[PDB]
From a paper:
The iron-dependent regulator IdeR is the main transcriptional regulator controlling iron homeostasis genes in Actinobacteria, including species from the Corynebacterium, Mycobacterium and Streptomyces genera, as well as the erythromycin-producing bacterium Saccharopolyspora erythraea. IdeR is an OCS from the DtxR (Diphtheria toxin repressor) family of transcriptional regulators which typically consist of three domains: an N-terminal DNA-binding winged helix-turn-helix (wHTH) motif, followed by a dimerization interface that contains most of the metal-binding residues, and a C-terminal SH3-like domain (21–23). The main function of IdeR is to repress the expression of iron uptake genes when the intracellular iron levels are sufficient. When iron levels are sufficient for iron ions to occupy the IdeR metal-binding sites, the regulator is activated and recognizes a highly conserved 19-bp sequence located in the promoter region of its target genes.
We determined the crystal structure of Co2+-activated IdeR at 2.0 Å resolution. Each subunit consists of the three domains typical of an IdeR protein, an N-terminal domain containing the DNA-binding wHTH motif, a dimerization domain, and a C-terminal SH3-like domain. Two metal-binding sites are formed by residues from all three domains, coordinating two Co2+ ions in octahedral geometry. The overall structure of SeIdeR is highly similar to the structures of IdeR from M. tuberculosis and DtxR from C. diphtheriae. The structures of these IdeR dimers are very similar to the DNA-free dimer structure. DNA binding primarily causes a slight shift of the recognition helices, which is necessary to allow these helices to insert into the major grooves of the DNA.
Residue numbers in the entry:
A (entry chain A): 3 to 55, 58 to 59, 62 to 200, 204 to 231
B (entry chain B): 3 to 140, 150 to 231
Write the structure that this text describes.
């Protein structure tokens, strides 16, 4: 189902870090729909293998493995959108499985094919291109970018859509709404002022984002 | 490691059928590098789930359910192999091992896109037919037999999945020119269980009986 439980535990910790959220067992359980028992046993198996280690934090090995999974995921997402032509809202679900079966060998081919891509189709930067040995490393979080929930709470304003985090992409219906209204990387949006739904307004229309969703969407305020 | 054990056992039995090899637990143990105890326990569980049946010969037979599931995995495998060669440009001898993992995670949604992208492909890059394209909704002889029957000039048509597991061998075959669509000269051999001498365009090579068996050709 998860295809690789360890890699999905590694990448969910890395996802929470990109979302600026503290990695906690309770959140890993909520994200991967796992029981408290299952998480505690999986975390136990991973710290033994020297992947993770206050009160969760990745090791140098676990961080590299987490990044290599994310790299495969986002290279897979580009391949699926740009070449294969799978629907924008269905691509993440596919990449969630593909990320666990891709060699570094096929990645190097995909990097050349896609022309040294830096971001996923959802605007998220592709990490570990230095460890693959075909590009520069990236910061998990760009300090220039602001979160739609922060922009809203701070009084709103017009902003450029930059990143939609992996957590948002688990809902295809939501990804369909964002595509229609025009909340997509490179498009400008109007974030209305405001635990209360954030009103976002595109060129065509708008939609209401839950705090957790709004937090995951990162924008450049004009 | 195998990604999906059940799917690999189903496709390994389907492989042995395509290769004209009697499907025994010993064959699965060799192909999937499993221990005897592991293979026996897996086959037992798969029979309970109605995927295969064990004959009195001790030989394994896929149910209509098991075949249907085996066909879907193989379809994904060969659609992945075409994508990996024709589009992505992964090396000829490295693509099978890649497809061997991809085959377990590819949706039908993607398969339908790959069918359109690759222009309705009928065979893998290794010449093996792509099965279950209908279900998705969109005189060949073995080199070992041709050799034993006096050899001759033959068009290479298919290289079985068994041969593709050895990248070094696939490199030799690529060099000498034993590849789907290229003519070869199969030299006659007297003895059974003796290596088959094949002459390609760019030189000659020595195939073991099991390898020669796995390659299918159209005699000219
Ligand atoms: Co994604
Ligand atoms: Co995944
Ligand atoms: Co193959
Ligand atoms: Co496989």
């Amino acid at each position: 189902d998860l295809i690789d439980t360890t890699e999905m535990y590694l990448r969910t910790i890395y996802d929470l870090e990109e979302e600026g959220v503290v990695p906690l067992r309770a959140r890993i359980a909520e994200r991967l729909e796992q029981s408290g028992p299952t998480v505690s046993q999986t975390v136990a198996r991973m710290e033994r293998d020297g992947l993770l280690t206050e009160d969760l934090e990745l090791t140098k090995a676990g961080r590299a493995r987490a990044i290599s999974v994310m790299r495969k995921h986002r290279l897979a997402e580009r391949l699926l959108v740009d070449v294969i032509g799978l629907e924008w809202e269905q691509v993440h679900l596919e990449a969630c499985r593909w990320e666990h079966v891709m060699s570094e060998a096929v990645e190097r081919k995909l990097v050349k094919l896609l022309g040294n891509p830096t971001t996923s189709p959802y605007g998220n930067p592709i990490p570990g291109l230095d460890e693959l040995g075909v590009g520069d490393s990236v910061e998990p979080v760009d300090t220039d970018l602001r979160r739609v929930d922060e922009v809203a709470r701070s009084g709103g304003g017009r902003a450029l859509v930059c990143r939609i985090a992996e957590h948002v992409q688990l809902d295809p219906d939501l990804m369909s709404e964002l595509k229609k209204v025009g909340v997509v990387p490179g498009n400008e949006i109007d974030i209305v002022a405001v635990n209360k739904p954030i009103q976002v307004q595109g060129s065509e229309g708008g939609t209401q984002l839950q705090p957790g969703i709004a937090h995951a969407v990162m924008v450049r305020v004009k």
